[PDB]
Amino acid sequence: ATVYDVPGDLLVERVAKALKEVPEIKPPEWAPFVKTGRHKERLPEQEDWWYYRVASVFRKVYIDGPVGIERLRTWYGGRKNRGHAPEHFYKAGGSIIRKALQQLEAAGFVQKVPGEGRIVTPKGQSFLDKIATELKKELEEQIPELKKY
Amino acid sequence: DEGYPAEVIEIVGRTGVTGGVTQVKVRILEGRDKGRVIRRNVKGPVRVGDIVILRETEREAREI
Amino acid sequence: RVIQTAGKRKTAVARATIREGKGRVRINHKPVEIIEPEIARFTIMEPLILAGEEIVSRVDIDVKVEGGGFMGQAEAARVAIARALVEWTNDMNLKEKFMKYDRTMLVGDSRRTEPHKPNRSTKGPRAKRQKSY
Amino acid sequence: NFRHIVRVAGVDIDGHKQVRWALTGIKGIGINFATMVLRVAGIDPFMKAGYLTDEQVKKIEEILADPVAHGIPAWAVNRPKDYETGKDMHLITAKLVMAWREDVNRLRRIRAYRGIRHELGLPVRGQRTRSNFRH
Amino acid sequence: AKPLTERFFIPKEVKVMGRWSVEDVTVEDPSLKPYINLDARILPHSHGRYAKKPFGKANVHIVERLINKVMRSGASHYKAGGHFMRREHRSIMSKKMKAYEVVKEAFMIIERRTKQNPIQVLVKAIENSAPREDTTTIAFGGIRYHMSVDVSPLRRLDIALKNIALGASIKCYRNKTTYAQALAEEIIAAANKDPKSFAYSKKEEIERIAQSSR
Amino acid sequence: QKARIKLASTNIKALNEVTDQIKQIAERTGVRMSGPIPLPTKRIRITTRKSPDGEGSATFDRFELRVHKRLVDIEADERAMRQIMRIRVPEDVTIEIELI
RNA sequence: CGCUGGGGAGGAGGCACUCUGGGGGGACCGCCGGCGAUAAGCCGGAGGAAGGAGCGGGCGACGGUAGGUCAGUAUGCCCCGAAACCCCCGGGCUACACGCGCGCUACAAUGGGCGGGACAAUGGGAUCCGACCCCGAAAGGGGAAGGGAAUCCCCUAAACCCGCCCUCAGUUCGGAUCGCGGGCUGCAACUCGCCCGCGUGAAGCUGGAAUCCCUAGUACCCGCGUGUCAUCAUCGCGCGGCGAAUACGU
């Protein structure tokens, strides 16, 4: 019924499938020629990765809002194979996250607090709870102990 | 080959050059010699009441 | 009524609340039935399976955990839940069952780390550099 | 319908493989640049090569010829700001080796530290040679 | 991909991992009966306890023992199968998650193939891999002999489990075969007395040497 | 109006002295107080090497300076402020006062 | 928000739970059967958050080692005193046929990659930490709240779980070495600095004789502050997360 009652990966898939019917969310010019982080070597192996990215950003804003573009940069980082040198954690880049948040605002799913992160609007809060109610109505057929929630 | 049970009764002491062996007294409870307590070396942690499997029933061991 | 309770484990504290209800158990906003992984899920569910059906079917439980890894959190939560169940039911039968099964359910663990010493400080107090001769 | 050895410019590749890895066999073309080429060409990089029509082969080679005109970004290219033309450009196979050689030779001609090191066969990027670099 | 009905499992009774019974099992070896723990439980995880107490190895479940013997990194400073198996970063050391999953898939394959209970199968395997005899070096008058000495029921188990896990680690080194499948093969062979079992091989080798030195 | 006093020192006895003094001066008069409130202790650690040369195994020397802190709010009544500023504080204690 | 019962954010207002830091209790072979000697103590067993100097540390004697330090300060004799004193401006300690010590990275599946889900602690911060917003593909650039340390920042750590591709191959292992390009710190980056993007793709397929570290929240494995610091950590001192195997001896 609510976001906190279903698994995140499933929810993100079921939300990214719908993010495409929304037209204000489109990949930019440089999406195919770009790597998702200094901490990476090869490019994403999917053609529709932008929408998964923006769904994840939506849901992280929901959960941990108000949140700005450094905590998400940290959550989208990892350890870099540096060769003969040993491994260290490194942060991602700050154009993908920013363009995603701008497009979400254009669609009206998030708003910026003046000086404190960024948050969800009521319709942005409706979208996810709808999708989660659907996914839960589905899972309750396989996990018959999910009804009480 | 199927051995013969033997119940431990008394720990005598530790033997061996390194100290990983233990001389012990055992009584038989299944075979041609049920009774006939004997002395036998034993490798590993052991405690009284335990029960061991013996392949040879006549190979009584040395004292210490 | 309401009963509050606590539970500890290495660099981890859990606070639990219990009352009358339907049978729901949330650990930090997400239900137990979908906790991951399974090795951390069985740890939390053990007392709810031991207690039984007619006892848990009529209680709603809530837990908030903070600090120290998924295993620490799960154990702290199991401890809190068991203490709260006993405080709420008042059954020495349940107490003895839990203590037979595992006594740390109600008598928590008391082990923290040991500080390190100056030969290989990162590795630990008793790991040391390799000598040469 | 299926082939076992396709022939992109000069070089031959393994049709039993995916295209992004089969194109990795042309010196000057990695996995990332291969992915970019295939995306600007309109081809799934997960299809087993061999199902590659001369249509697609010709398109890929014309791409490789002039990448910055088809929109390959100038930064994602082998040789930006060439010495005597500007003209951020790309080089594969037979052209590449000659560029390396000509660069090192012009370093040698002006009697520079890097060219002298290239001659003697020693390191060039500031490493320490007392305990390692043993033949 | 696992189905959801297995990715999200919820036990309804007190059975090992919530799936397999432990009361129908049996043991006919009296020397080991009191050292094989078959208590009805769900999660076989003891967080290090029962280790500093000398005989704490008798209150732990054989399944947890096998799991902690599975948490291996090949063999160092000695050799098994004719090679050093040194990994150093790719090993499941301090990963009971992965060890649990391995033993789970193993018992799955065993139940699928044998049509019996994997714990009963494991008990018979441990029996048929339990050595009753070994060697040692005793001294009198200042010379070194080589004698045959009986082994205790607490060390028999240790060697059996160690050898099973070694055979598993061996059948999987740089081959298409997996750790779980190799462990299942090892257990089946040890139970059915097939020389393909590192464990049965080692047992017969030990007893042979000892009978010789007798 | 309220006044907030912060106290820091390497000695617990001076802190207890000042606390007792202001607590009693505020009690004998009619003023609702606050505290004493303990804040966490600040530890300055320094690990150095003993030998002045290189030779010899490495034996390290760990020095520590602990600093204890206290906080109070006193409500800054008519005479309370002027009778509290008239305190005889040792010179091993750092006392500051802020009006809110 | 569904099936109407459940679920979150402010704010008042409270300290109950958590936590912080002051004082105090509690465990002593004390009770219970042996052995020894009727003593000293050891061993069962009981009871007990914890048992047998509870656990981890600090302080380390009379003296020796002609052990190391005059290149940390202090200090006697000789020596330079217009130099061997005191400043600047450029080079070197980074030079390389080789022999050794300590480590890092690997030689695969007990895994590589891409995409998504998670959970810490210790410590530090003035021309210092910098949230939040905006440019740039990335490295990085321009504004700037708050903070003089339970108030703000550095800080959503990694190993781990899920789904797809690779399926025992010098490879989607490995990642040195070289080329073209873009930037920071600094009075000055060739000699001789760190970082980024695209290409190139070297030995290595588990290791002889020998040898080292470790007894419980310990070792193995995973990453994190800090010390040095105008920049630069494969190092030192510490921090936590996951977590065993064997012996209770000679």
Please classify residue E99 by burial: count the beta carbons closer than 10 Å to its beta carbon, then call 0-12 exposed, 13-18 middle and 19+ buried: buried
Q: What is the full DSSP assignment across chain E?
A: ---HHHHS----SSSBTTTB-SSS-----TTTGGGSB----S-----S-SSSSTTGGGSSBHHHHHHHHHS---EEEEEETTEEE--SSSS-SS-HHHHHHHHHHHHHHHHHHHSS-HHHHHHHHHHHT---EEEE--EETTEE--EEEEE-HHHHHHHHHHHHHHHHHHTTTTSS--HHHHHHHHHHHHHHT-TT-HHHHHHHHHHHHHHHH-
Token couple for F76 = 């800054």
Q: What CA–CA distance (Å, rounded) separates D15 from D48? A: 6
Q: Which is it for the CA torsion D89, D95, D96, D99, positive or negative?
A: negative
Quickly tell me which residue has 């489990």 as its tokens.
E161
Residues in Cβ contact with C111 at an 8 Å cutoff, skipping those fewer than 6 apart? C10
* E46 CB inside 7 Å of strand G: yes
Cis check for the bond before A66: say yes or no (omega within 30 of 0).
yes
| Bases of strand G lying below 7 A from some protein CB | 1-3, 5-8, 16-23, 49-50, 55-57, 59, 67-69, 72, 94-121, 123-124, 130-140, 145, 149-150, 154-165, 167-168, 172, 174-182, 190-201, 205-208, 210-225, 234-250
Asked whether D19 and D47 are in contact (CB, 8 A), the reply is yes
Rounded distance in angstroms from the CA atom of residue A86 to the C1' atom of nucleotide G232: 16
∠E178-E182-E21 over CA atoms, to 5°? Answer: 110
Q: Which of E144, E149, E155 minimises the CB distance to B45?
A: E155
Method of structure determination: cryo-EM
Q: What CA–CA distance (Å, rounded) separates A119 from A108? A: 11
Helix (H, G, I), strand (E, B) or coil at A78: strand
Name which of E26, E32, E19, E27 is nearest E161 in CA terms: E32
Give the DSSP letter of residue D109. Answer: H
Stretch (H or E) spanning C5? strand C3-9
Token couple for E146 = 């080589």
- The strand pair at F93-99 and F3-9 is best described as antiparallel
Asked whether A107 and A101 are in contact (CB, 8 A), the reply is no
* D25 CB inside 7 Å of strand G: no
- The strand pair at C30-31 and C25-27 is best described as antiparallel
Break-preceding residues in chain E (C–N over 2.5 Å): none
Helix (H, G, I), strand (E, B) or coil at A58: helix
∠E20-E126-E14 over CA atoms, to 5°? Answer: 20
Q: What CA–CA distance (Å, rounded) separates C43 from C38? A: 8
The number of residues making up chain D comes to: 135
| F chain contacts of residue C119, beta-carbon cutoff 8 Å | 58
A123: which nucleotide lies closest, measuring CA to C1'?
A: G1
Residues in Cβ contact with A122 at an 8 Å cutoff, skipping those fewer than 6 apart? none
Asked whether A64 and A72 are in contact (CB, 8 A), the reply is no
* F79 φψ region: left (φ > 0), alpha (ψ -120 to 50), beta (else): alpha
* B35 CB inside 7 Å of strand G: no
The number of residues making up chain C comes to: 133
E35 phi, psi to nearest 5 deg: -115, -5
Q: Does C60 touch chain E (CB under 8 A)?
A: no
What b-and-e string marks burial along A131-142, b requiring 16 or more CB atoms within 10 Å of the CB?
Answer: bbeebbeebeee
Q: What CA–CA distance (Å, rounded) separates E17 from C42? A: 8
* A67 CB inside 7 Å of strand G: yes
**Are E10 and A145 an interchain contact pair (Cβ–Cβ within 8 Å)?**
yes
Q: What CA–CA distance (Å, rounded) separates B53 from C11? A: 48
Asked whether F70 and F2 are in contact (CB, 8 A), the reply is no
* D96 CB inside 7 Å of strand G: yes
Quickly tell me which residue has 């009544």 as its tokens.
F77
What b-and-e string marks burial along E159-168, b requiring 16 or more CB atoms within 10 Å of the CB?
Answer: bbbebbbbbb
Name which of C70, C82, C102, C93 is nearest E44 in CA terms: C102
Q: What CA–CA distance (Å, rounded) separates A16 from A14? A: 6
Token couple for A55 = 């769904």
Helix (H, G, I), strand (E, B) or coil at C15: strand
Q: What is the resolution of this structure in A?
A: 3.0
- Tally DSSP H helices, then E strands, for chain A: 5, 4
**Side chain identity at E23, as an amino acid letter?**
E
Please classify residue D4 by burial: count the beta carbons closer than 10 Å to its beta carbon, then call 0-12 exposed, 13-18 middle and 19+ buried: exposed
Show the 3-state SS of B15-60.
ECCCCCEEEEEEEECCCCCCEEEEEEEEECCCCCCCEEEECCCCCC
**Are E11 and C50 an interchain contact pair (Cβ–Cβ within 8 Å)?**
no
Give the DSSP letter of residue C127. Answer: -
E96-114 and E179-192 are packed helices; what angle lies between their axes, rounded to 10 degrees? 50
What is chain B's alpha carbon radius of gyration, rounded to the nearest angstrom? 11
Q: What CA–CA distance (Å, rounded) separates D8 from D27? A: 12
Please state the separation of Cα C115 from the chain's center in Å: 25
Q: What CA–CA distance (Å, rounded) separates C9 from C111? A: 8
Q: What CA–CA distance (Å, rounded) separates D35 from D29? A: 10
β-pair partners for C79: none
Q: What CA–CA distance (Å, rounded) separates A24 from A20? A: 9
Asked whether A8 and A16 are in contact (CB, 8 A), the reply is no
**Chain F residue with Cα closest to C120:** F58
- The strand pair at E147-151 and B35-43 is best described as parallel
**Side chain identity at E110, as an amino acid letter?**
I
The alpha carbon of residue D24 is apart from the nearest alpha carbon of chain A, in Å, by 13
Asked whether A149 and A1 are in contact (CB, 8 A), the reply is yes
Name which of C41, E6, C70, E4 is nearest A10 in CA terms: E4
- Residue D33 half-sphere exposure toward CB, CA atoms < 13 A: 22
Asked whether A1 and A132 are in contact (CB, 8 A), the reply is yes
* B45 φψ region: left (φ > 0), alpha (ψ -120 to 50), beta (else): beta
β-pair partners for B13: B23
Q: Give Cα separations from F67 to B49, D56, E16, F38, F63 (angstroms).
A: 61, 75, 54, 12, 14
**Chain A residue with Cα closest to C36:** A7
CB–CB contacts below 8 A, A to C: 17
Name the CA dihedral angle for F14, F20, F21, F22, rounded to a multiple of 10 degrees: 110
∠D79-D81-D85 over CA atoms, to 5°? Answer: 110
The alpha carbon of residue A29 is apart from the nearest alpha carbon of chain D, in Å, by 10
**Side chain identity at E165, as an amino acid letter?**
A
Q: What CA–CA distance (Å, rounded) separates D113 from F86? A: 77
Token couple for A101 = 């948040």
Q: What CA–CA distance (Å, rounded) separates B10 from C42? A: 44
Q: Give Cα separations from C72 to B18, C11, E67, E145 (angstroms).
A: 42, 8, 20, 52
Token couple for E212 = 């010789």
Q: Give Cα separations from C21 to A48, C44, E116 (angstroms).
A: 44, 19, 42
Asked whether C23 and C59 are in contact (CB, 8 A), the reply is yes
Q: What CA–CA distance (Å, rounded) separates B18 from C122? A: 35
C70-89 and C38-51 are packed helices; what angle lies between their axes, rounded to 10 degrees? 10
Q: Does A32 touch chain D (CB under 8 A)?
A: yes
Alpha helices in chain A (DSSP H): 8-16, 49-64, 71-75, 96-107, 122-139
Q: What CA–CA distance (Å, rounded) separates E171 from E161? A: 16
**Chain E residue with Cα closest to B53:** E132
Q: What CA–CA distance (Å, rounded) separates B12 from B7? A: 15
Stretch (H or E) spanning F17? helix F12-28
- Residue E129 half-sphere exposure toward CB, CA atoms < 13 A: 33
Asked whether C36 and C25 are in contact (CB, 8 A), the reply is no
β strands within chain F, DSSP E: 3-9, 34-49, 60-73, 93-99
Cis check for the bond before F36: say yes or no (omega within 30 of 0).
yes
Quickly tell me which residue has 């045959």 as its tokens.
E148
Rounded distance in angstroms from the CA atom of residue F51 to the C1' atom of nucleotide G87: 34
Cis check for the bond before A44: say yes or no (omega within 30 of 0).
no
Asked whether C76 and C40 are in contact (CB, 8 A), the reply is no
Neighbours of E16 (CB within 10 A): 24
* A49 CB inside 7 Å of strand G: yes
Asked whether E183 and E103 are in contact (CB, 8 A), the reply is yes
End-to-end CA distance of chain B: 30
